[PDB]
Amino acid sequence: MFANDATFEIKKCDLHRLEEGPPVTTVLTREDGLKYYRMMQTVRRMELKADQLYKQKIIRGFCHLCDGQEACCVGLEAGINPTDHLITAYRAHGFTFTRGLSVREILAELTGRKGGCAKGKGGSMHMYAKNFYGGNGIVGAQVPLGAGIALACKYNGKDEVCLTLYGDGAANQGQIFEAYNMAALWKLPCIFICENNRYGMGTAVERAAASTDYYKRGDFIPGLRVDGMDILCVREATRFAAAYCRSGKGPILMELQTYRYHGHSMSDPGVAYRTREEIQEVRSKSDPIMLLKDRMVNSNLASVEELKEIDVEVRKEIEDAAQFATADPEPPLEELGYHIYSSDPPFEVRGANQWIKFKSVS
């Protein structure tokens, strides 16, 4: 029989414009640990899977995988609530799943099928969910949007908050700095989060940014820098950071310091801008799923047996989701025109030529 919780020591954050950071000590309960592992491992396998479904061509266009970053998407969900708000770029599969979306529904959109979550319309970048808003493929364009979401929280006065991610190569986009300033000026419930995975498509953090301290870019906005490879850290900085927003002290920058195992999209061999054996080093010594495992086994929170059973049940949700989304009918062609406008009467949309007519209904 098992210990019920254990306390773990986690890395002191770097602070900018704060006197105190999140706690260096945290408590992990067996019941969360098992939930958090099941999640990281669902996300991880859902990506080994899509990757393979790419290579057989079953998926097309874009597909940016997010393995290595599973501490993030789980750690985040771990420290916000259902009622809070999340918006992100294109590396969205992990978040999409952690916000109420089934593997069936995600895989079915990657393979463009009627039963996929955007009804086949948006593919890999444009998945939306309850209080998850994409899924945005124009870089930096989701930061002002997240600050706007923030604005609606503050305005509805429901005490919700908003996590608004951008990656490191995106932290030079003008629209972010404008957003910091309105964010701070109006004191918005907006957490700005930078997924620093060290690369910006191909171009490494130092070749493109004059300062690589993204947690201090905000300047007037207070920031903190975190270990995004460790699930506990990510959960404690989020909670901390979310406390800060809930109490009205405005915006706050989080630099989540992570890593992506795959190249940019699936058309990046991934290895021109980095040795394959850096990638290997990171996977060996600081994999996130392999970090929760060493903690759990070692403090008697779970047995090497139980996590195996879960690899197993997970292996299963994935097989079936794979197999449901490969055998699913594409959208009917009659529905190409559907959902251009909300709440409107039906109308007619023009095809390749003037005799090809499509019905559009909201």
Binding site: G148, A152, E178, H339, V349
Partner: protein, 329 residues
């Protein structure tokens, strides 16, 4: 009761805001300076900082924030000081707003409104004179409209606030000061103008003249002159620019057999480009008894000198000239 275009807009926002609280407005100088062209005058004082926000010179930014509010279920009115400025933020308009509903497979609506003066003013010069009717009218996912008189502006703005899709309301600075009468039902706070419908401003039988925004008044100008000589123009005011009301143009052409289109902006790929194309693809084509022709601005960046500027926008002179070439009278 004559009311000015600027007052019509102001009345509508006021009516809409009062009626729904999820609606608010944002931009530079809207709040305390009372709006750049005083359109939003007195509104800050009524509804306060919560609802009328002054924002920094951050177009790309606040375009974005307003679209975030809309997604999150608010109903923002997002003012650009002119549309030349909204180029910075156009990518939030097309890419965030317009396409979103369809990319989400009908999951995420975006009930935003973007508004402001469009096109030419007086001696504001090249970076400040440009019509964007053509550019916005292109993209599926949007609704673009272009008021003429006061009835137009009130109905069109209020409809715009009530629609649940992203709607561009291009107004025209020279028109704000201009006073029209304001029929009883248009003072009712219930007054909407259906997006998608044109309206005939003037019955005619000889030619169909089609316009949007400021030029529409020059068309009636030019019809008064022309009617003195026995010509009877049918001046059509487009109102909407996407989903534009072709059927009404087409039912009118089928009766007059002739067509002139007039617009403020540049010729190539313009509003009039699309009107012709449709006509010619459409059933009206075979009712045409002459080529349809276009009057537009000249194909230059707006110059500053008076006589240069004067010859860069369309006069009563130039519409009449074209109506005579077309009518061959």
């Amino acid at each position: 009761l004559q009311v000015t275009v600027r007052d019509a807009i102001n009345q509508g926002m006021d009516e809409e805001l009062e009626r729904d609280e999820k609606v608010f407005l944002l931009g530079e100088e809207v709040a305390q300076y009372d709006g750049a062209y005083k359109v939003s005058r007195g509104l800050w004082k009524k509804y306060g900082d919560k609802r009328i926000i002054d924002t920094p010179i951050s177009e790309m930014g606040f375009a974005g924030i307003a679209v975030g509010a809309a997604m999150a279920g608010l109903r923002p009115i997002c003012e650009f000081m002119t549309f030349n400025f909204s180029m910075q933020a156009i990518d939030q308009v097309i890419n965030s707003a317009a396409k979103t509903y369809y990319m989400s497979g009908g999951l995420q609506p975006v009930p935003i409104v973007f508004r402001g003066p469009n096109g030419a003013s007086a001696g504001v010069a090249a970076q400040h004179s440009q019509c964007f009717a053509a550019w916005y009218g292109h993209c599926p996912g949007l609704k673009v409209v272009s008021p003429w008189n006061s009835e137009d502006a009130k109905g069109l703005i209020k409809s715009a606030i009530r629609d649940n899709n992203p709607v561009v309301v291009l107004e025209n600075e020279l028109m704000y000061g201009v006073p029209f009468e304001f029929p009883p039902e248009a003072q009712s706070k219930d007054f909407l103008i259906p997006i998608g419908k044109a309206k005939i401003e003037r019955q005619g039988t000889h030619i169909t003249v089609v316009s949007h925004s400021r030029p529409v008044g020059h068309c009636l100008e030019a019809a008064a002159v022309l009617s003195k000589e026995g010509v009877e123009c049918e001046v059509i005011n487009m109102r909407t620019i996407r989903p534009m009301d072709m059927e009404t143009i087409e039912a009118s052409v089928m009766k007059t057999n002739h067509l002139v289109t007039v617009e403020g902006g540049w010729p190539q790929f313009g509003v009039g480009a699309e009107i012709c194309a449709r006509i010619m693809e459409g059933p009206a084509f075979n009712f045409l008894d002459a080529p349809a022709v276009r009057v537009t601005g000249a194909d230059v960046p707006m110059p500053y000198a008076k006589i240069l500027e004067d010859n860069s926008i369309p006069q009563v002179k130039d519409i009449i000239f074209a109506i005579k070439k077309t009518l061959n009278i």
